[PDB]
Amino acid sequence: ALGKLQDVVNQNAQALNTLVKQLSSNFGAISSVLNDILARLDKVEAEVQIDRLITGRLQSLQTYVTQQLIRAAEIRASANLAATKMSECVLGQSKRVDFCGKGYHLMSFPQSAPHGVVFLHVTYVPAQEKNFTTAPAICHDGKAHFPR
Amino acid sequence: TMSLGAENSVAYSNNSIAIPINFTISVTTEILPVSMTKTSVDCTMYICGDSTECSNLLLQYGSFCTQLNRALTGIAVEQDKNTQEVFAQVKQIYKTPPIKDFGGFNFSQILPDPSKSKRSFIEDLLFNKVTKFNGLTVLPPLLTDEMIAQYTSALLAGTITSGWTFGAGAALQIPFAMQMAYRFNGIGVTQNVLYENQKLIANQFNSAIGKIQDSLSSTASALGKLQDVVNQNAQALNTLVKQLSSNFGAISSVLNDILARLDKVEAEVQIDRLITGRLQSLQTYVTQQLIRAAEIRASANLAATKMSECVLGQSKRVDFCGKGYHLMSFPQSAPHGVVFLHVTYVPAQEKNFTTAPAICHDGKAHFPREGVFVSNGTHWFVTQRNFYEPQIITTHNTFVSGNCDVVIGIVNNTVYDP
Amino acid sequence: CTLKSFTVEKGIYQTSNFRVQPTESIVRFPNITNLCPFGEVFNATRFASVYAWNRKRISNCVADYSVLYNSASFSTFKCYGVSPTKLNDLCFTNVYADSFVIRGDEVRQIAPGQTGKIADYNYKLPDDFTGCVIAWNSNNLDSKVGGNYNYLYRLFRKSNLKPFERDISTEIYQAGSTPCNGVGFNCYFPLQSYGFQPTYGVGYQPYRVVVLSFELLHAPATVCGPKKSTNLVKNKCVNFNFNGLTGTGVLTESNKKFLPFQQFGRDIDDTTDAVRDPQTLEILDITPCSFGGVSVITPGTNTSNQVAVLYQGVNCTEVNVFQTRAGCLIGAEHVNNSYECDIPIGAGICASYQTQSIIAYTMSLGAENSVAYSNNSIAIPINFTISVTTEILPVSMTKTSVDCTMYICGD
Amino acid sequence: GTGVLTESNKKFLPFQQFGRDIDDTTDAVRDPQTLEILDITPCSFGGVSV
Amino acid sequence: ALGKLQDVVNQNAQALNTLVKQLSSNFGAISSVLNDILARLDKVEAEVQ
Amino acid sequence: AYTNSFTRGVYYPDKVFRSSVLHSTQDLFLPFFSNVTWFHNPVLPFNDGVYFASTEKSNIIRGWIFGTTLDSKTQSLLIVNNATNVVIKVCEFQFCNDPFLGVNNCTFEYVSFKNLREFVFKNIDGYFKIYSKHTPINLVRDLPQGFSALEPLVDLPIGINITRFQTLLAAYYVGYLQPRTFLLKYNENGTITDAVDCALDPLSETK
Ligand SMILES: *[C@@H]1O[C@H](CO)[C@@H](O)[C@H](O)[C@H]1NC(C)=O
Ligand SMILES: *[C@@H]1O[C@H](CO)[C@@H](O)[C@H](O)[C@H]1NC(C)=O
Ligand SMILES: *[C@@H]1O[C@H](CO)[C@@H](O)[C@H](O)[C@H]1NC(C)=O
Ligand SMILES: *[C@@H]1O[C@H](CO)[C@@H](O)[C@H](O)[C@H]1NC(C)=O
Ligand SMILES: *[C@@H]1O[C@H](CO)[C@@H](O)[C@H](O)[C@H]1NC(C)=O
Ligand SMILES: *[C@@H]1O[C@H](CO)[C@@H](O)[C@H](O)[C@H]1NC(C)=O
Ligand SMILES: *[C@@H]1O[C@H](CO)[C@@H](O)[C@H](O)[C@H]1NC(C)=O
Ligand SMILES: *[C@@H]1O[C@H](CO)[C@@H](O)[C@H](O)[C@H]1NC(C)=O
Ligand SMILES: *[C@@H]1O[C@H](CO)[C@@H](O)[C@H](O)[C@H]1NC(C)=O
Ligand SMILES: *[C@@H]1O[C@H](CO)[C@@H](O)[C@H](O)[C@H]1NC(C)=O
Ligand SMILES: *[C@@H]1O[C@H](CO)[C@@H](O)[C@H](O)[C@H]1NC(C)=O
Ligand SMILES: *[C@@H]1O[C@H](CO)[C@@H](O)[C@H](O)[C@H]1NC(C)=O
Ligand SMILES: *[C@@H]1O[C@H](CO)[C@@H](O)[C@H](O)[C@H]1NC(C)=O
Ligand SMILES: *[C@@H]1O[C@H](CO)[C@@H](O)[C@H](O)[C@H]1NC(C)=O
């Protein structure tokens, strides 16, 4: 039922698990383990092997930060929408169609959730329609009458 | 030096009001992009392609090709979401009656032509004006253009036959002229102003739809907002494919020529320069496509909001559903987007009147119940403020509040008591 | 295996790239049979002085470079832009063989992008050199009793040589204000000699040098390795090699209107689209063998172990079986009914697990309805239902921060 | 390396010398002179704010 | 009150100052000064730096 | 005397087939609207390469001499064309401006107003190239404002140094090639149909 909030948790977990796994990549060095290179080689050759790890790990971290900057702007759009729903929908009575649930909006109530908000939108939905003949106006003594 | 517009000194004074004698029904057109082409790139087929030698070197970089293919897959699946948020708002596929008794209003240019996809006449103008081995693939959308046209048809058939009611529950039928009288009443213009002018209002609407048809047939330049979404994606892919021909400091940009000319210990040094440059070339493309997809999502969320508030309702939000006071609007599909034909009341022929905040009868101040007091030379009347219709001042048209002494600008005139 | 889990939720997952593999392998070299005249260079009586290096152009022959690189005679055999082991598989537009003698220390100067007396005043190689430098000690041939003075080099010049510039001029060089005058103090005759003696130390002993320069253009070959041509094969997926243009694809007969000088053709992205057979006036279109994405369509593994497979863009004649516009769909039953979309396949098609097996169907947009419109009929609600609908919105992320010095460099 | 060392209840089989975790980390080790299994943990770290 | 406008002005100034300060970095080369590499080293070595 | 070249002197830049594509290429080309010389004789400089054209009716022009000295000390290239053979020869020739008064340490030999004959001579990489085109025209031979591309005749590995040339004898035009970037319109069935000289004017640079 809360798949929107759990999706935001799962994306942040997949991003961090990917960032950590990229420490195990060689990037073309003789080992992925920074302690092996320094335990096995002297400065002149260890600086060649380490700069391959620096270059790949810095690219790995720049990719993570760039995708978190893009993902934060999507959460800020949802937080600015939730802030607008609390003002117009909870603190008021909205006359905007579909903004505050299906049907004509009466009121709504905020409930908190992990990293999110839940609105319980109360609305009047009409039921049991019946047909009837109708008219735009009525003739009385030659005067045309319209409903107020 | 650019002109900001013509100057206009408005004729303001403490006792003058201008009220419109007449109106024009205006049909404005608004175009919004909703989705991109679902292009997806195989990172290994782009960087290497066929070569096992390059593929085994690319494994040393770890998760990057899964991370890039995951990002382009998220952009691709979101284009189907954006299209569902806009069009798939209607619960049931409504159909118009076979008899077009809409009170003189003519929807033939915007309803389906069943002889044809079964698009409207204006949807065919909109569909005409807009126009594999490197690891690039183009995926089809989930909804075909014929399915999008069935949704715009259902939204339009619900709107014409049942007003806003199909957005709030079951569609309740109402005669189209009576629906228009309540859309007039919703902008503060009294219902009789429709029924007494119904043939003029119908002819102004029918004429304004004819100007949309002529304008969309005449020039493509209006749809530049949709065509730019095609052009930005095409320039991104042309740049990504051109970057396969770059050397990046390798002996050749052709991977098979490196493999045909050199043994492993030398070939792997040349191939890693191509892997490095081609990986950076693809990371730059996916980053700018992620930022571009977020701009299209914002425009799809705006188009989905315009369909709820302008099409399924009657917006009171100024300039949200075109210029003038919004009456209703109609959805028409276009490739990668949506078009709204916004019907609005525009007041057209203002005249100057003397005005007052209140009037004095038997030593008591009367205020207009709804409307303005206006003077026709020597005489005083009360009118609705959006269309000139001078009623006599009466004890029903007005309410009292206290003595004459408090109000600034009050005038002495008789109130009739029926 | 793709999802790194033993459980799979309902969905459609990309898992692989499908490819047709080549069923045969081809080599296509020109009609030529005579061995190249390398012996006229490597067994020459003598080479020129290095300031006046001698160039032979080699063409229209087969070059067995193994005759060269297997020999223990060569005290040096370096290659640039090619491996010597690989030369018997290649083809070249021309080969230029350049020949001279220099002392054993100076052989270092015969390499790309060098600076020095021999490199800049006698024989300069280009920066993007493709070719081989072959050298051997010649103290047994070029050194002589009392010294051999037939071998010379330029020691002074007004400006450095460009790549493959040749300059035999004997004119006097000027090192100061002193005019050359056919003679002086800070003015010099610019040419000098090694005087090679058979008793010289090995750095001053003569070495014979041959440099082979290879050019491969957008052009025909005229020198090719000894690698035998074979029969042409068509409409199958094949691995191929036309004049050293290694690749893989379906070869077809084709009607590209080549003008007589055009040797091959290119697509709008510069990929090689067609070739001319080096043994026939026949034009072959090169098309890639069938490949594309593979997506697996599944209910949850908690529900069934059945799956269906979509070969994306692939045609069912060239992979129950159903041709969607998304690609060939295999293992899902086509159905004439329509339902709400369960798993989305594309172009109006969806799939579900139903009465059980996987089915594929055209999605249904909603229930069909006609509103009972008339010019004098309304409808009014007799009643109402107060409705409560839950809306969920995300508001925040986890506040992560990373010490980039500790992530990158680990303390 | 650098870390805190402690006892562990990691059930190393007789052929296993060390344990691993996905950061490319050695997670635990068998002491070569006395065959107990030690947890390795990072020495405590964090940002400083003023 | 105007902190939203000054923040937008300050961010663009900080990003340009950072872009220009990255010209002083070596990225592993012998020097950050492009003329200094060409003064010290011969063609094939200088081009790798 | 002088003439406007219009868009003359375009040639197929490489031995590659292309169709329905615009190809952007750098090479020695005659610039658009360049200022070509006109003649009835003399020895001329060769610069980076030559575009040459002539009035194909009387058939008086038969070939060319190319070299530095044109008379001994070093080789010159001789080209002669007649009703049975094209002949090309390289020698330490000692003739004046009329070897056809007769006709030398030779090193290479090879054998093969109503109309406009056009030629390009270029001496780079694999040495001396010839491109040509022959087409009917209206009777005013003033380099017509239409467009066509010259096709390669021969490509000769001869290694010679050329700084001057002369014609073997109608009227003829001479223009010089320059290092230039062109955009070429390969329309359909391999054929170049239009071009932009990208350095001519700001609109061509925009195209
Ligand atoms: C209204 O009239 C239509 C047409 O006669 C009919 O289908 C419908 O059942 C009637 N009743 C209601 C509740 O709409
Ligand atoms: C109102 O405008 C219509 C045309 O839009 C015109 O025919 C009509 O005469 C006008 N009426 C008045 C009162 O100006
Ligand atoms: C509706 O408009 C079209 C286009 O002007 C016209 O051909 C058609 O006859 C009109 N229909 C009616 C019922 O007036
Ligand atoms: C209203 O009054 C002003 C000032 O007298 C005048 O300039 C303007 O033209 C008048 N407008 C109309 C519609 O009469
Ligand atoms: C409106 O004013 C005019 C003078 O401007 C006057 O002739 C007319 O009688 C007035 N209207 C009425 C209903 O009296
Ligand atoms: C309005 O009527 C009152 C009472 O008759 C009088 O005092 C006042 O002067 C009048 N004002 C005007 C402008 O007629
Ligand atoms: C190539 O050689 C074969 C015989 O080996 C001959 O039949 C064929 O005509 C030749 N083709 C060309 C283009 O020389
Ligand atoms: C699939 O390939 C066959 C054989 O070429 C062809 O008849 C059919 O039209 C193709 N269908 C599609 C959708 O590509
Ligand atoms: C209205 O609906 C309620 C249940 O929601 C029911 O108890 C009531 O009898 C209905 N009234 C009418 C007039 O149908
Ligand atoms: C040394 O190492 C071995 C490892 O198996 C252990 O058995 C032994 O107790 C240790 N100490 C001595 C004194 O051997
Ligand atoms: C350049 O062209 C003009 C116009 O044809 C001509 O008058 C002029 O003499 C030419 N100049 C040179 C140096 O070619
Ligand atoms: C000229 O024509 C004669 C005809 O016998 C022929 O022998 C010769 O090859 C041709 N070419 C030249 C340059 O002499
Ligand atoms: C070609 O010969 C001329 C004769 O003056 C000479 O100046 C020039 O240097 C030579 N070309 C080259 C590329 O050296
Ligand atoms: C080449 O294309 C042109 C397009 O105008 C056409 O006239 C010509 O007939 C074509 N040639 C062939 C061989 O089809």
Author numbering:
A (entry chain A): 944 to 1091
B (entry chain B): 696 to 811, 813 to 827, 854 to 1140
C (entry chain A): 301 to 483, 485 to 620, 641 to 676, 690 to 745
D (entry chain C): 548 to 597
E (entry chain C): 944 to 992
F (entry chain B): 27 to 66, 81 to 143, 164 to 172, 186 to 242, 263 to 300
Show passages lifted from the paper.
Changes in the spike (S) glycoprotein in these variants are under scrutiny because the S protein has a central role in engaging the angiotensin-converting enzyme 2 (ACE2) receptor to mediate cellular entry and is a dominant target of neutralizing antibodies (nAbs) elicited by either vaccination or natural infection. The prefusion SARS-CoV-2 S trimer is composed of S1 and S2 subunits separated by a furin cleavage site. The S1 subunit contains the N-terminal domain (NTD), ACE2 receptor binding domain (RBD), and two subdomains (SD1 and SD2).
The B.1.1.7 variant emerged in the UK in September 2020 and spread worldwide, with reports of increased transmissibility, virulence, and mortality. B.1.1.7 spike affinity for ACE2 was improved over the D614G spike by a factor of ~5 as a result of the N501Y substitution. Multiple populations of the 3-RBD-down and RBD-up states were identified, with a higher proportion of RBD-up particles observed for the B.1.1.7 spike (~1.8:1 RBD-up/RBD-down) relative to the D614G spike (~0.8:1) and the mink-associated ΔFV spike (~1.3:1). We identified several RBD-up structures, including a typical 1-RBD-up state and two 1-RBD-up populations with the up RBD and its adjacent NTD disordered. We next sought to understand how variations that are distal from the RBD/NTD region influence the B.1.1.7 spike conformational distribution. These variations spanned multiple domains including SD1 [Ala570 → Asp (A570D)], SD2 [Pro681 → His (P681H)], HR1 [Ser982 → Ala (S982A)], CD [Asp1118 → His (D1118H)], and the linker between SD2 and fusion peptide [Thr716 → Ile (T716I)]. By contrast, the T716I substitution abrogated an intraprotomer hydrogen bond (H-bond) between the Thr716 side-chain and Gln1071 main-chain carbonyls, suggesting a local destabilizing effect. The A570D substitution resulted in an interprotomer H-bond with the Asn856 side chain, reinforcing the stacking of the SD1 loop against the HR1 helix of the adjacent protomer. The HR1 S982A substitution, on the other hand, resulted in the loss of an interprotomer H-bond between the Ser982 and Thr547 side chains. Thus, the S982A mutation appears to disable a latch that modulates the RBD up/down equilibrium, thereby increasing RBD up propensity. In B.1.1.7, amino acid substitutions that destabilize the 3-RBD-down or closed state to favor RBD-up or open states are balanced by substitutions that stabilize the prefusion spike conformation.
